[PDB]
RNA sequence: AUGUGUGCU
């Protein structure tokens, strides 16, 4: 027959999509490829590497700044930016602040067509005489790439940062059983998606389906 | 038995429950009440966790 | 091989010879002594328990058989071997909860 | 008459007919109400042989009071269904739980799938 | 816990953080190795979000049994992605995230008793 | 699990009290028309084919979901034996 | 294996992953070539298997092989009961028939 | 960086397909979902019911016939009967012969737009005076259809046969690598398909692709 | 309707 697609969205991050009824087996058949696509294909961005002034190693501690360097570096990974035009491929955010102020992700001086979809993300609390002058790289990767795989040495002694590109935080799916009067062994696809807010779940799903279709068009010109 | 009858049959239970009885009934937890799910096949399907209760393999 | 024969499951040959007529109801045997003794091949005889006993031929017309060699299979034999089931490619592993 | 569509012989059902739980196997009456022999709630199947021991019986016993007996061999072929009992020679009993289709079954790098999956926790 | 590989200390060596780490990248000591106090899997891989650690697992970089560093409710935790996944399971099972991390135990594997 | 049973068990002195309450509630809810319910406008039990649980699929489900709100009160003796039976059949079809 | 290595196919990425995990497991010997690792595994009755409903190889080699399994005399159709209300008896009102 | 598609169709029973390159693990993301549809769906052709000359029930025998009725019919399942046009929905093949000869499947009376790809198939050995006069009805369906379901009564004593519709017999995929000297981690998909002949592996592959595509379209309108 | 026997749990 024809399966209906029902959405239960909760804002901009979480959505639960249910497509039913499905022919036997097609539940995982459809649900599983998308899950792979979602966690590794959707184009987002991330912090690839960061340079700080009085910081040499990744495992250092800067007095005046309470939070250890690694802790800050985590929070750098926790932010999500968005590029207005496709032209922007690699952009560098600049940051500078001193004293008993704290730095949030909105303090990064806005560079051209760069939007910060998450401003109040705590970057670092600073004490008296706490000087902090850092800079951050932003590339347009696709998925997750450990720091010790790229480590973009933008400056001379910058620090590699694990690049968490994939907009989806996580994607989980299940195939329950549904009936159609005659038969009860009909697959029921329930697919839940968790994002960082860069893109709503439905948009991401749209992305997945498109990506799969374009791939299905590759089996057309034999040689 | 057409679709109508089956759909009706789902409308006749909903919250209703049935009692499932073990071969040798020993202790209190030897008979439980479960909500019936219209499953194909011909054997009674029983939940994993309630086995060791009335000792069923 | 011993079980099927000793249990009188299948039918064997009594004396050397060639094959006359392989039907699904009979197997006629060419004894050298100018004799062909009639063999029934019984298809659907209800067991005392409920199962079905079938004797099916295992030699083709125009073949020389020997004394004590099989001509048909029993309800649970395959070419003379006790056939009590199936040989299935099994993977031993836990699978969901099934 | 629709229930008699299989009744071929004058009293005996045809051989090779399909009988189902409630189908009429034998036709006979007593003191006139129907007291015939129908197929039990279980299952019939396909008739293979119909034995009938009459009164003019060339040397039989036959139960006292009874004039004639009508026995029907209803055969049927049963496939392996969820719930059947399977075991080996080493001694692992086990009822069939699910019959997964070929596609969602653990398979080798070769195109060849597995037939049966046996829990290691039973060992 | 695998072969010690090369050198087993970091109970205090100030250099051992930036140094021994590179060792694993060389060939010296494997990932979840009892390299004392920590292990390269804890230094190399620090995951910001508790969720993100599990996202990394789906990219075959760290197994659900490799000891790494995560951050549940805002603090550094020495544990494996699988364990934090167990924590998350119990959490979202009963909707109460607070007691979920309190009721379980994240220092030993899960058995009948646990 | 069931509609918030922990609230229900705590709601009464003995666990059996709840059972009798629910049962009798279902009974009168079925015998005197399913209209004498105490939560029929928007906050009400529904089903899956149509939303037609609004009428009469299950009796107990209703009783349990009703008791969940302070709309009903149980107890030993509250109303005379016959009078209750009479007026409960009068006020409704 | 000779069939594959000969036909024009080699060590699948999935096989390689499973081997990598098998090293940590303790079955295969650290050092050999993926082919020899697979040999060591095959010797132990174990072989790389794919989930089938995903494609993801089951992380950890499992012993596979054909065994002899027999369908016992019990069935389910031989034992199936489901009556709500039917015949009773003239001598005893307890339901059976 | 555009995926190349190579075909290696050896005959009509076997078929091999190559796709290279794919970005990251996208081989498995395509390999499995197709294998599922290739084994599950796809229109096939099998024998539905058969009527023998004097045979009434499935549990019989025939004078001059080594194989009992069940065994004979059991062979008809291993038969492949390739049609030509979609119009052919119910082709009732006929077969009758006598004399000492192995009745191969190449003896069926030929029909207008129908071909038997499986000629050598053993039906029954005929004995001195053995003679069989049978009508083998062939239908077109999909997937596994147990005979105890349809029960197609062609004649009157016709005995229904398990319909096993699935031209695709076996499928397996392999994921290699190489190509593009820049990024190392890449995928190379190689999908091997074995079909019974009624449908060439290429045709099956294309059909499966169409199926998957149609299923992808379903995620359109939410509710 | 009771006994004998076997099968499984
Ligand atoms: Mg038991």
Curated annotation (Swiss-Prot), chains A, H:
<dbReference type="GO" id="GO:0005737">
    <property type="term" value="C:cytoplasm"/>
</dbReference>
<comment type="subunit">
    <text>Homodimer. The RNAP catalytic core consists of 2 alpha, 1 beta, 1 beta' and 1 omega subunit. When a sigma factor is associated with the core the holoenzyme is formed, which can initiate transcription.</text>
</comment>
<keyword id="KW-0548">Nucleotidyltransferase</keyword>
<comment type="function">
    <text>DNA-dependent RNA polymerase catalyzes the transcription of DNA into RNA using the four ribonucleoside triphosphates as substrates.</text>
</comment>
<dbReference type="GO" id="GO:0003677">
    <property type="term" value="F:DNA binding"/>
</dbReference>
<comment type="similarity">
    <text>Belongs to the RNA polymerase alpha chain family.</text>
</comment>
<keyword id="KW-0808">Transferase</keyword>
<feature type="region of interest" description="Alpha N-terminal domain (alpha-NTD)">
    <location>
        <begin position="1"/>
        <end position="223"/>
    </location>
</feature>
<dbReference type="GO" id="GO:0006351">
    <property type="term" value="P:DNA-templated transcription"/>
</dbReference>
<protein>
    <recommendedName>
        <fullName>DNA-directed RNA polymerase subunit alpha</fullName>
        <ecNumber>2.7.7.6</ecNumber>
    </recommendedName>
</protein>
<dbReference type="GO" id="GO:0000428">
    <property type="term" value="C:DNA-directed RNA polymerase complex"/>
</dbReference>
<keyword id="KW-0240">DNA-directed RNA polymerase</keyword>
From Swiss-Prot, chain B:
<protein>
    <recommendedName>
        <fullName>DNA-directed RNA polymerase subunit beta'</fullName>
    </recommendedName>
</protein>
<feature type="binding site">
    <location>
        <position position="57"/>
    </location>
    <ligand>
        <name>Mg(2+)</name>
    </ligand>
</feature>
<comment type="function">
    <text>DNA-dependent RNA polymerase catalyzes the transcription of DNA into RNA using the four ribonucleoside triphosphates as substrates.</text>
</comment>
<comment type="subunit">
    <text>The RNAP catalytic core consists of 2 alpha, 1 beta, 1 beta' and 1 omega subunit. When a sigma factor is associated with the core the holoenzyme is formed, which can initiate transcription.</text>
</comment>
<comment type="similarity">
    <text>Belongs to the RNA polymerase beta' chain family.</text>
</comment>
Swiss-Prot record, chain C:
<comment type="function">
    <text>DNA-dependent RNA polymerase catalyzes the transcription of DNA into RNA using the four ribonucleoside triphosphates as substrates.</text>
</comment>
<comment type="similarity">
    <text>Belongs to the RNA polymerase beta chain family.</text>
</comment>
<comment type="subunit">
    <text>The RNAP catalytic core consists of 2 alpha, 1 beta, 1 beta' and 1 omega subunit. When a sigma factor is associated with the core the holoenzyme is formed, which can initiate transcription.</text>
</comment>
<protein>
    <recommendedName>
        <fullName>DNA-directed RNA polymerase subunit beta</fullName>
    </recommendedName>
</protein>
From Swiss-Prot, chain F:
<dbReference type="GO" id="GO:0003899">
    <property type="term" value="F:DNA-directed RNA polymerase activity"/>
</dbReference>
<protein>
    <recommendedName>
        <fullName>DNA-directed RNA polymerase subunit omega</fullName>
        <ecNumber>2.7.7.6</ecNumber>
    </recommendedName>
</protein>
<keyword id="KW-0548">Nucleotidyltransferase</keyword>
<dbReference type="InterPro" id="IPR036161">
    <property type="entry name" value="RPB6/omega-like_sf"/>
</dbReference>
<dbReference type="InterPro" id="IPR006110">
    <property type="entry name" value="Pol_omega/Rpo6/RPB6"/>
</dbReference>
<dbReference type="GO" id="GO:0006351">
    <property type="term" value="P:DNA-templated transcription"/>
</dbReference>
<keyword id="KW-0808">Transferase</keyword>
<comment type="function">
    <text>Promotes RNA polymerase assembly. Latches the N- and C-terminal regions of the beta' subunit thereby facilitating its interaction with the beta and alpha subunits.</text>
</comment>
<comment type="similarity">
    <text>Belongs to the RNA polymerase subunit omega family.</text>
</comment>
<dbReference type="GO" id="GO:0003677">
    <property type="term" value="F:DNA binding"/>
</dbReference>
<keyword id="KW-0240">DNA-directed RNA polymerase</keyword>
<dbReference type="GO" id="GO:0000428">
    <property type="term" value="C:DNA-directed RNA polymerase complex"/>
</dbReference>
